[PDB]
Design a protein that fits this description.
It is classed as cell cycle/dna. The structure is cut from a larger assembly and holds one copy of chain A (101 residues), two copies of chain B and one copy of chain C (500 residues). In chain A, 54% of the residues lie in helices and 0% in strands. By secondary structure, chain A is mainly α. Chain C has helices at 2-6, 18-40, 47-69, 74-85, 94-110, 115-123, 148-158, 165-190, 199-211, 221-236, 244-267, 271-289, 293-313, 316-334, 341-354, 361-371, 377-393, 401-411, 416-432, 441-445, 454-469, 476-485, 492-499. The chains are: A mainly alpha (101), B alpha+beta (146), C mainly alpha (500).
């Protein structure tokens, strides 16, 4: 929704609309999580929700970093040194639910 | 209360008026209450919630727009309803057990009364993810050395 | 500098030292990739810009020609190849794109050690293609086609090497190149990868191939189609592969069978040497008009040669006859009116109708029908849908007895998915041909009582379309009675019957 | 002397420049992720209390 913490809301509630463009550099962890702790009138419930949100964000960042690193390492190992009736249900009793009267 | 809808399909089939004439297939229960004090957050004067039930379809209509069975739960949580707690709803002849209950259950009841149950569940869920990112970070350092 | 180095057909040696080569190359690389693409395309990111654009087009064309003339050193070649592969991945650069086609195909022609590098640098960045409806297909041929497919066709046609055994082994190299490229593409395409798919890309590639199947001036397209067919059928037959790849492969085979049969049924319904001569002279004139035709001509030559060899293999009378064929082939190789577009098209159509590809459709059907008895549900569903599409293209194909027994068996099959697929086929066939449906009505209207929710809805939709489309049908009353009979069966079905 | 240096790895220079730049990027990303982890643990302690 709306706010400098909407991303964490989404990551804690819906998580599907959150795109690979959002996750990467939208939120500066060391600043946003720091913002969450002294924020005015924060209920414990919503705080727990936000905790799961920020942890999911961080986990996704880890996933992407691993994927890109693996891609790079696979690249670097390259070089160029030039030197009939088969299965029918038995009759119709399987699927021929009879008409009522 | 969510707890009721944990029954077998037979019970759902048996939870419909089978009195006379034809046999129904689409029962529905609606409740209209007023959050004039804005205890419930969504601003209206008479919030309406109904639960259409059929043999296969189970749906929540909140002011004539469909919902997804989770948004409504978090909404009711925010209102103050505890969707899973037997507390403040006492079935006929089942009050005595709240006194002769073993201690641990009463502690869980009190912990919920404090409003620290959802936080506990979310933290318990988050710990696993944390451990898996630890494994991931180990792998990343390995690959950097390579 | 790049015009002065090239312009004469002949100069003394050492009048152009590799330093100016390297300089102009890196210059175009940096200026292009850092000034042109950002201002011409918002993906990466006044009159002086268009001026520089025109300058770069002239540069790359002249440089292509220069690279064709003399030999060069691989270190320069890596830079040139990277710069020439670059333009295919921004938006509004069409003319630059086809000059880059020229450059890359010259590089692919001369040096037979960088082919793998160009294939990798194409494959790596296939995600970065435009895939926007506007400006997708910008290589004229109405009738536009995609770009990287034109590049692929040009490449595969390029390596022919027309000078004995050279003709044989060169055509073998061509076949190996095509098989390798296509195998890599399809295998990387099928399975669902992380965060991105390839199936729409491959679908567009195959739609393109079908669009350019038999023209006078694009051989090797039928070669790609043949190898594609054989690869697909050897790909989804066995039981070792994954699932989604089998699904996608069977889908592609269905598409190609449809287009093949449809163009067939709507098109057709020493003389060979004279035809070859006429078509070849047409091509010869068009070389003068427009380049790149030389590769096609040499390809036709090599293919006629290998076809004569295969006719030898499959007598002394026909041995001498084919040696006269081969001798005339040698004559025309050594030699290196009034026929125009439609005429040449019909000529190559006939010569193709001699080749062992036009008689493949039959085979294809048989192959699909081997699939229908198998032990995976999704595969049988897709077989049924592809067969349904085939049938609804050419409605006079529900005649062969094997297809009859197939669709009956699958109509009685024990899984609601394939049952609804079969009834959908039969329903579309009945709706298409208004009459001649009085033979399938009984086997159709038996299916209302079929214990799913798919099949019931499908039969009700088909019945509704009948009762709207062609009234005065005899069985109207019974149809109305049965549809009213099912009013209380379910909820969604209830809504459908009520609104109908 | 050419015959001694036959099997040389061409394209080495581009490899070097590009992969060193990308290694720089990856190191910075990893450090940021580490600082974030520390921050998360701090918040978890505050919430528990």
């Amino acid at each position: 929704k709306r706010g400098p913490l909407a991303k964490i809301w989404l990551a804690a509630h819906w998580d599907k609309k959150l795109t690979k463009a959002h996750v990467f550099e939208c939120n500066l962890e060391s600043s946003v999580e720091s913002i969450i702790s002294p924020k005015v009138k924060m209920a414990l419930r919503t705080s727990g929700h936000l905790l799961l949100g920020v942890v999911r964000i961080y986990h996704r960042k880890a996933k992407y970093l691993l994927a890109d690193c693996n891609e790079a390492f696979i690249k670097i190992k390259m070089a160029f040194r030039p030197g009939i009736l088969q299965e029918n249900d038995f009759g119709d009793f399987g699927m021929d639910d009879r008409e009522i009267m | 209360s969510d707890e009721f809808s944990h029954l077998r399909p037979e019970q759902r089939l048996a939870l419909l008026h089978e009195g006379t004439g034809p046999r129904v297939i689409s029962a529905f229960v609606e409740i209209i209450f007023d959050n004039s004090d804005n205890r419930l957050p969504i601003d209206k004067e008479e919030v309406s919630l109904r639960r259409v039930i059929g043999a296969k379809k189970d749906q929540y209509f909140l002011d004539k727009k469909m919902v997804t069975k989770n948004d409504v739960m978090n909404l009711l949580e925010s209102a103050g309803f505890s969707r899973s707690n037997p507390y403040y709803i006492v079935k006929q002849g089942k009050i005595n057990q709240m006194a002769t209950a073993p201690d641990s259950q009463r502690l869980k009841l009190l912990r919920e009364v404090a409003g620290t149950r959802v936080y506990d569940e979310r933290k318990e869920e988050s710990i696993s993810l944390m451990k898996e990112t630890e494994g991931k970070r180990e792998k990343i350092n390995e690959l950097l050395k390579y | 500098t790049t015009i002065n180095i090239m312009t004469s057909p002949n100069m003394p040696k050492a009048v152009y030292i590799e330093d100016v080569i390297e300089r102009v190359i890196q210059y175009t690389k940096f200026h292009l990739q850092n000034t042109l693409y950002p201002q011409y395309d918002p993906v990466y990111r006044q009159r002086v810009i268009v001026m520089l654009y025109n300058k770069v087009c002239d540069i790359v064309s002249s440089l292509s020609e220069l690279l064709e003339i003399q030999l060069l050193t691989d270190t320069t070649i890596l830079q040139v190849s990277s710069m020439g592969i670059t333009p295919f991945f921004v938006e509004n650069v069409s003319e630059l794109q086809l000059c880059a086609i020229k450059l890359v195909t010259a590089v692919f022609s001369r040096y037979e050690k960088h082919r793998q590098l160009i294939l990798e640098e194409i494959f790596t960045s296939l995600a970065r293609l435009p895939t926007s409806k506007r400006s997708l297909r910008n290589f004229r041929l109405p009738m536009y086609i995609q770009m990287v497919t034109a590049l692929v066709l040009q490449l595969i046609q390029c390596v022919v090497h027309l000078p004995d055994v050279v003709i044989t082994n060169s055509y073998e190299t061509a076949m190996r190149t095509a098989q390798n490229f296509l195998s890599i593409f399809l295998k990387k395409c099928g399975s669902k990868q992380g965060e991105e798919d390839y199936r729409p890309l491959f679908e567009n590639f195959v739609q393109d191939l079908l669009s350019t199947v038999n023209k006078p001036e694009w051989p090797a397209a039928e070669l790609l189609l043949s190898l594609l067919g054989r690869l697909l059928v050897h790909q989804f037959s066995n039981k070792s592969t994954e699932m989604a790849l089998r699904v996608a492969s069977l889908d592609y085979l269905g598409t190609v069978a449809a287009r093949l049969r449809k163009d067939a049924v709507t098109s057709k319904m020493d003389e060979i040497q004279q035809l070859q001569k006429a078509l070849l002279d047409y091509l010869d004139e068009n070389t003068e008009t427009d380049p790149s035709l030389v590769f096609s001509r040499k390809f036709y030559i090599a293919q006629w040669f290998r076809d004569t060899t295969l006719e030898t293999e499959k007598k002394e009378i026909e041995t001498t006859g084919q040696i006269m064929h081969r001798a005339e082939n040698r004559k025309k190789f050594l030699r290196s009116d009034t026929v125009d577009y439609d005429d040449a098209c019909l000529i190559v159509r006939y010569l193709a109708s001699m080749r062992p590809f036009a008689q493949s459709f039959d085979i294809y059907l048989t192959q699909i029908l081997r699939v229908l008895g198998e032990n995976a549900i999704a595969v049988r569903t897709k077989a049924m849908k592809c067969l349904s599409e085939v049938v609804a293209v050419d409605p006079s194909i529900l005649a062969r007895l094997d297809m009859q027994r197939g669709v009956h068996g699958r109509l009685m099959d024990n899984s609601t998915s394939v049952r609804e697929a079969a009834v959908e086929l039969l329903g579309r066939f009945v709706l298409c041909r208004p009459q001649l449906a009085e033979q399938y009505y009984d086997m159709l209207i038996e299916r209302i009582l079929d214990t799913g929710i798919s099949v019931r809805k499908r039969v009700i939709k088909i019945l509704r379309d009948i009762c709207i489309e062609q009234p005065t049908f005899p069985k109207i009353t019974e149809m109305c009675v049965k549809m009213i009979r099912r009013v209380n069966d379910e909820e969604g079905i209830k809504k459908l019957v009520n609104e109908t | 002397e050419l015959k001694k240096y036959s099997h040389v790895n061409k394209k080495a220079l581009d490899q070097f420049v590009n992969f060193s730049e990308q290694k720089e990027k990856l190191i910075k990303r990893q450090e940021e992720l580490d600082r974030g982890y520390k921050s998360i643990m701090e918040l978890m302690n505050v919430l528990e209390l």
